[PDB]
Write a protein that binds this ligand. Structure first.
Ligand SMILES: Nc1nc2c(ncn2[C@@H]2O[C@H](COP(=O)(O)OP(=O)(O)OP(=O)(O)O)[C@@H](O)[C@H]2O)c(=O)[nH]1
Ligand SMILES: Nc1nc2c(ncn2[C@@H]2O[C@H](COP(=O)(O)OP(=O)(O)OP(=O)(O)O)[C@@H](O)[C@H]2O)c(=O)[nH]1
Ligand SMILES: Nc1nc2c(ncn2[C@@H]2O[C@H](COP(=O)(O)OP(=O)(O)OP(O)(O)=S)[C@@H](O)[C@H]2O)c(=O)[nH]1
Ligand SMILES: Nc1nc2c(ncn2[C@@H]2O[C@H](COP(=O)(O)OP(=O)(O)OP(O)(O)=S)[C@@H](O)[C@H]2O)c(=O)[nH]1
Lengths: 426, 429, 117, 426, 429
């Protein structure tokens, strides 16, 4: 087995709606309805994300944490919004100020206990717990601060179960906030030291990948979210399906993290073709690896081509030859020996489910642990200093009971984190 | 006699379902258990209508054993004999051997002690595992482990599917296979080996099909295996007991690993072509492109071969076809070995799946052997290991699972003397 | 032509430049202005610049110099930063003209100004 | 296997529409439809020009390169225009100026990478690549400049696969442009040093051959194009058919090029009789060689009778006697011993397919490597100097980032090219 | 035993399909393989109800071998025995021999080692190639090359279709034929030669038809060849083994090239006319307008002829018809040769295509021989070469294909001593 999703902040929340929008259909669960599942296999493993109460009501086992009512009151007042048991909504009608400090030390710190409470009600649900899924943005209060706390507590309560983190690291070109590097640097800090699998997505790496890899001209947020949620479904849920060679969070973790930092990955989906036309079906397989392993198509901002890889996990999910899979992976590992690090004879971790994404014939989620993501924490870390130096909007933090040594801490930490990652690029 | 069998790991279970299929198929026992001693060394005549299997199934994810209890054959085994640990598989030795795998073992054993009792003077347990897995490497490691002590007085022939030479799957594979070798080494009697990749070649080169589903490789081993137990434990003109093997097949205590090979692999659709001569199939056995193992006799001197024939075969035909071979020299046999050719003759010809892709001849040669060749295969698989260990790679995954720098480093040293062993017992006179 | 301009630029700046596209980084443009004005914050300019974000800083610096001086000439950073050949070719051509008219007698040490970068 | 057509410029493009108009019918491929093929043989070898995606949609594997939208937007908005996958259209909405320099150094140089990209997507299609077909005119920007670049890049990427070039060398009498010799001399230069088989066609050699060898009174462009496309079908595609004695691009190349220049040929079709009346059927065979080997009927401007031949390749395609074929060729070689060069005992390369041009009984493409084409590059080269001397419309080149030594280069090169060719006429 | 056959090059394959046709046609084996030892020296009884061929097919373009697996006969060979290299043919020796052709050879050999094993004490490989081609000249060059070493202990009779004297096709032809001669020379046993053009004459002058499709010339050689192997390896009143040939046919190690000739070539439609006498056909054999070779006995003294007769023939008729000849003098035989007339008598008359254009007599004479005549044919073909080499012509096409100024110049010198050889062994006493 199981897992318990966590919708920290608005973003992490907004996405919840999309991650569950999807996943459900990938499990035949209508709003409050039950399992309409076109098949019978989309049920033997659901437990991983739901709970048995009525007999038609398998309720998503996630948490909705946020200090801004309106948000959860938009997610709960729309489509699938009426499937979460109200108990799940851990709101904080307070002022959800955009301060990491306001949602981690002053405002969020209160709402925490009333959260952990539930995160335990859900964990002690039944069977055996695997880990928790965490969605949020490292550029706000309820996201980076309060969600980054939720984990620091989770990881003290079950240092056994895993912790995948889906972070929306502050996009480069244009940030959707001003203190961004403040709320960010501070949350990455907490991440590098609690969760043990992080999948960093960039609102603009998506646009690109969504406006040129999907001739999509008006990529609304819903979309971006939708694309992301597509990857997190391939990861988890997927592997909780049969397969010639299946893995599960741990395999993924125990094959992808060479060194305890926790390291962050960069997810990539397979068939990413525009609707009508493009429906080329060039998906024999070399076409999927063609996809997944290119620069563009990496939900991350940075480009792999800018730094070796430590590990890779092509989590495919659609009937294919353990030969044309196991094989391709190789040439790929040799055509690009340059960037793929050497002290790991077989960086790649081939994974293979069976049933594919409901309406598709063949897909393959990509979870890359490349050293390229160095060039992102750099970014973030830079923005900090350039503004920390002048203590820019620092009074909104300190004035909330913070420390001048707290910011120092994080930057350094996360800043060192950049350092290390280079220790392998070389 | 009989010979129980423990199919461990999803794979060992898929292959199991396969080898188990071929069985009834050539014994007239529909999936319903009913047919309308001889073969009692693999089937117990439970109740007064059926033939409950004579083995068990061990996987830590339900998925794979589940599928068995869906598809006809569902009726074949006892609801009991298919062990599962709803928990987690984990493609890591440690967890499967120590931590998790432990919890189940007792229960597992219980069956191989409950199924081992019910019989009449047995001979051993044909174990089916997939070297580089979690439930397959680890678990068994201690299963065979707990057997060598509870029945040291029997045969422990483990039929493995060791790591594809270049087409491996798991990222860690070697960690899991250098560990299943060292822990099982001091416990097995004879370990048969069938290379997953080197079998594909056979499907490409000797049958033609770029569409080989796992379900095929399984039909194949599912064949070579049928030649081992099934038919052999079955009357014939030159019977060969299980003990026979290990005796005529292992020169030294290391649970020595021979290689499985089959002769007639030809695709249906070829099915009509004039059949092959006793001489041709015999000769096909000395071709490094037909041996279910990427251990091409690159130098490895054979040191003992057990030519199991089945079907219409005249002992002179053999005691001649083999003579011709003994004098080909380019087939160089070890020094300290005058004659190393155990001729096993059975009656009943092979039995091909009704409509898979196997030719269906009236005679075959499932020759297995110990070849100084694996000096390679082990080498190439050991080296792998180091590279990663050299950086600890996925080490934290085992340590955190009740293992230590010991078990790795000390299981590496282990195989080291397996690279020297397979070197000394040959290459020298 | 591209060949002629590149030769001129490399000699003036003591640069390696193989192709015009390299100018897309914006460093060279800033230094050309520096040779004329000598007002540019050279330490700030990312001479070596690998990444686009760095290019933007160079552009900003270039833009500021134009503004400070009251230079009317248009600079379309969006086009240039792409490192497309045509846009850069055109800009470089204008810059050379600017340099020819503006550059004073005083000698310029490109290496020193860069800090030998 | 295979080959990948390349529609450089408008002309090369306009012709694409005709080369594909034909070829398709010579392969039963309707607009987007599939293989309606009257037979079953027009399919076992198609691959050479298409790709398998749907199962009724074999899409032409060509490239459409042009800096003038309107053009490709006329080819894509008309008949067969809707068969090319949009990915094929590598447009350059820029100002497709009529300058060789504007489509080779300044404007085209940008659009190039976005082309090579595809030329690789198509090359790495499947099976084994043979070479690429290239259509264009040496009298414009997108044609001579940008297309002449496309190859210089192609020939660096696969100096193994061949390169047939179909050039519309600047017709004499009247030039359909003004700088013509500028755009030309500059492109021939690039040709003599990259592609290894060039088939030069002349809009006025066609008119003639189309207004007197086809009483055709209103020879629209479509026609000319159509006639040309008729020859390029006999060449390639054809030989990718069975035959008592079949050849293929290489044979054609390895039998026609005595010296590495690349040398240019002059294609000639066989049955070229006016519709109704003329339908004389005098096509036993002596009638085809009668045709092919006469002066008029050589798509080139120059007349063979004005210079020996080095090689000849009668690529016939229609059931005939390897005797009445092999024989005729001989007398022909003796009646004209005068012009046929001697240091080659058997200049002629008899080739023989089986299936003929869909509706015809017997045809035979002619690919001549005569020294006569000396008297054309002369022409071109002359026009240059007469205008170069005064740097006529040179500012449109230089002002586009060009060199005064660039023009010098080409002329000389191509000018020397004239020289050499005479080294054999003697 | 028998005598395998390797048809190399599109042509050698077209001719192959032809010679292979005539076969079953006179052995009652429909295209389905089934007929309702003797001839076992060319057909293996795969079981079974069929008669799988006893040869192989090698072309680097699929086109031509493809057509075989379309048109009835499609059923005749084994899907396997028809080798192809999807790659490129190239009408150039070099590429076919070295560069490309190389890649396939192994595989090629494998069959002529896999097909050479299956049999019972064979005699050799009847090779079918077209001198002046890419796959035909080059490739074989090394095929026969690799044979002379792997089976030096057999017969290597290569049946060639050397360059039309004036009606060649390829522009380079000589390059490809001066190269297949020098490389094969030191490897063949007896090289039969059938001139493509000089066969047309026969189709114009001795059958009347200006419509001769390649499919005809093939029917012809397809005939003369049937007289060689087919019928000869077939019982008779004066059997002649393959070895027999080379022995009674080559006076010297140079893989000497005799010429093929047939006697009764008369067109159907003539089919009713009173048949020709044993004396006439015999005499027709000494006419330079009926010999499938533009080597008109312009002076070339015969030095050994193997008169293979078939049908109703009285040994005295022969041992008289030949006597009359031995004393015509204008037919001057070599000096050092008293008697050079190997009389081969078979029983079964010829067997003409149901409705092609071949008369269909009840007796024929397929006489082949070594004639000092080819002193010409080689000469005229050598000269060709020089002219081009003298200017390097299409040389860059080979060099760039793993060859050198060596192989050409050094293969020219080669044949040079073939112009002196065929000169010395004759013209002098
Ligand atoms: N021949 C054959 N090989 C198989 C089959 N299934 C898996 N394998 C091979 O065995 C190895 C896979 O082991 P896994 O399926 O990952 O694991 P497991 O051994 O079942 O146990 P866990 O790791 O705990 O799941 C790979 O090397 C596969 O190529 C099968 O059905 N037949
Ligand atoms: N008798 C006869 N001669 C043929 C036949 N086909 C081709 N030839 C002759 O053999 C030569 C042709 O060889 P090609 O077909 O060009 O080449 P190839 O030897 O098959 O091999 P490649 O050059 O690689 O294609 C010419 O001299 C033809 O006249 C045939 O079916 N019968
Ligand atoms: N992909 C994606 N990114 C989002 C979404 N909502 C917000 N973001 C991104 O997340 C960051 C801010 O997230 P936001 O949802 O405002 O956090 P919050 O904590 O809920 O904000 P607050 O309540 O303190 S103001 C910005 O970088 C923005 O671009 C969403 O639905 N999808
Ligand atoms: N045969 C033939 N010749 C053509 C065709 N279109 C143009 N031409 C010839 O090609 C030359 C100019 O070709 P054009 O198509 O204008 O090149 P372009 O590069 O596309 O032109 P631009 O975009 O720079 S102005 C002239 O000599 C003209 O006679 C055509 O469709 N068929």
């Amino acid at each position: 087995r199981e897992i318990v999703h966590i919708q920290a902040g608005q973003c992490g929340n907004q996405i919840g709606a999309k991650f569950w929008e999807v996943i459900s259909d990938e499990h035949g669960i209508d709003p409050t309805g039950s399992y309409h599942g076109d098949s019978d296999l989309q049920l033997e493993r659901i437990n991983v994300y739901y709970n048995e109460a009525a007999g038609n009501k398998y309720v998503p086992r996630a948490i909705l944490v946020d200090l801004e009512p309106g948000t959860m009151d938009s997610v709960r007042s729309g489509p699938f919004g009426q499937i979460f048991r109200p108990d799940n909504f851990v709101f904080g009608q307070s002022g959800a100020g955009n301060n990491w400090a306001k949602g981690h030390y002053t405002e969020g710190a209160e709402l925490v206990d009333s959260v952990l409470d539930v995160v335990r009600k859900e964990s002690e649900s039944c069977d055996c717990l695997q880990g928790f899924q965490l969605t949020h943005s490292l550029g706000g209060g309820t996201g980076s601060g309060m969600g980054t706390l939720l984990i620091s507590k989770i990881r003290e309560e079950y240092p056994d179960r895993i912790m995948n983190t889906f972070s929306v690291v502050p996009s480069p070109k244009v940030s959707d906030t001003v203190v961004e590097p403040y709320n960010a640097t501070l949350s990455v800090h907490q991440l590098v030291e609690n969760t043990d699998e992080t999948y960093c997505i960039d609102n603009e790496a998506l646009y690109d990948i969504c406006f040129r890899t999907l001739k999509l001209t008006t990529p609304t947020y819903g979309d971006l979210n939708h694309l992301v949620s597509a990857t997190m479904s391939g990861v988890t849920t997927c592997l909780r399906f049969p397969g010639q060679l299946n893995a599960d969070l741990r395999k993924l973790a125990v094959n992808m993290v060479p060194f305890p930092r926790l390291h962050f990955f960069m997810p990539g989906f397979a068939p990413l073709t525009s609707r009508g036309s493009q429906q080329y079906r060039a998906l024999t397989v070399p076409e999927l690896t063609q996809q997944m392993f290119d620069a563009k198509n990496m939900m991350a901002a940075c480009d792999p081509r800018h730094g070796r890889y430590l590990t890779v996990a092509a989590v495919f999910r659609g009937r294919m030859s353990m030969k044309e899979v196991d094989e391709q992976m190789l040439n790929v590992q040799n055509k690009n020996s340059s960037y793929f690090v050497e002290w790991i004879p077989n960086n790649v971790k081939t994974a293979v489910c069976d049933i594919p994404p409901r309406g598709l014939k063949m897909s393959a989620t990509f979870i890359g642990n490349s050293t390229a993501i160095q060039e992102l924490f750099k970014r973030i870390s830079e923005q900090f200093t350039a503004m920390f130096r002048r203590k820019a909007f620092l009074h909104w933090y300190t004035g909330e009971g913070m420390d001048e040594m707290e910011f120092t801490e994080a930057e350094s930490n996360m800043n060192d984190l950049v350092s290390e990652y280079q220790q392998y690029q070389d | 006699r009989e010979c129980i069998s423990i199919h461990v790991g999803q794979a060992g279970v898929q292959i199991g379902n396969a080898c188990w299929e071929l069985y009834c198929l050539e014994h007239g026992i529909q999936p319903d258990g009913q047919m309308p001693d001889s073969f009692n060394t693999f089937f117990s005549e439970t109740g007064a209508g059926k033939h409950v299997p004579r083995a068990v199934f061990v996987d830590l994810e339900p998925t794979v054993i589940d599928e068995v209890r869906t598809g006809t054959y569902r009726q074949l085994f006892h609801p009991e004999q298919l062990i599962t640990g709803k928990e987690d598989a984990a493609n890591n030795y440690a967890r499967g051997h120590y931590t998790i795998g432990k919890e189940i073992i007792d229960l597992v054993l219980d069956r191989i002690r409950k199924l081992a009792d019910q019989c009449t003077g047995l001979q051993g347990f044909s174990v089916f595992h997939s070297f580089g897995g979690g439930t397959g490497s680890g678990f068994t490691s201690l299963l065979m482990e707990r057997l060598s002590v509870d029945y040291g007085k029997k045969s422990k022939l483990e039929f493995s599917i060791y790591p594809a030479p270049q087409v491996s799957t798991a990222v860690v594979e070697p960690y899991n296979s250098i560990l299943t070798t060292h822990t099982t080494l001091e416990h097995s009697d004879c370990a048969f080996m069938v290379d997953n990749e080197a079998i594909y070649d056979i499907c490409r080169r000797n049958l033609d099909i770029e569409r080989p589903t796992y379900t095929n490789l399984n039909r194949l081993i599912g064949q070579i295996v049928s030649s081992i137990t099934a038919s052999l434990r079955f009357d014939g003109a030159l019977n060969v007991d299980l003990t026979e093997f290990q005796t005529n097949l292992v020169p030294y205590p290391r649970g020595h690993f021979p290689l499985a090979t089959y002769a007639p692999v030809i695709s249906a659709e070829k099915a009509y072509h004039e059949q092959l001569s006793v001489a041709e199939i015999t000769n096909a056995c000395f071709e490094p492109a037909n041996q279910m193992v990427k251990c091409d006799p690159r130098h490895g001197k054979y040191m003992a071969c057990c030519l199991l024939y089945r079907g219409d075969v005249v002992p002179k035909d053999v005691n001649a076809a083999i003579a011709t071979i003994k004098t080909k020299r380019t087939i160089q046999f070890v020094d300290w070995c005058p004659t190393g050719f155990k001729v096993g003759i059975n009656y009943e010809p092979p039995t091909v799946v009704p409509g898979g892709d196997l030719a269906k001849v009236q005679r075959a040669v499932c020759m297995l052997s110990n070849t100084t060749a694996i000096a390679e295969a082990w080498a190439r698989l050991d080296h792998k290991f180091d590279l990663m260990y050299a950086k600890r790679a996925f080490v934290h995954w085992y340590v955190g699972e009740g293992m230590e720098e010991g078990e790795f480093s000390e299981a590496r040293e282990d195989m080291a003397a397996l690279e020297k062993d397979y070197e000394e017992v040959g290459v020298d006179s | 032509s591209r060949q002629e301009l590149l030769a001129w630029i490399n000699q003036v700046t003591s640069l390696g430049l193989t192709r015009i596209e390299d100018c897309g980084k914006g460093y060279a443009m800033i230094q050309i202005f520096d040779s004329i004005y000598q007002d540019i914050p050279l330490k700030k300019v990312n001479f070596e610049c690998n990444n686009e974000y760095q290019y933007i800083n160079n552009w900003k610096v270039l833009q500021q110099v134009f503004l400070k001086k009251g230079i009317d000439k248009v600079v379309d950073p969006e086009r240039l930063s792409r490192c497309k050949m045509q846009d850069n070719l055109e800009f470089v051509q204008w810059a050379k003209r600017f340099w020819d008219q503006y550059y004073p007698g005083g000698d310029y040490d490109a290496l020193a100004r860069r800090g030998n970068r």
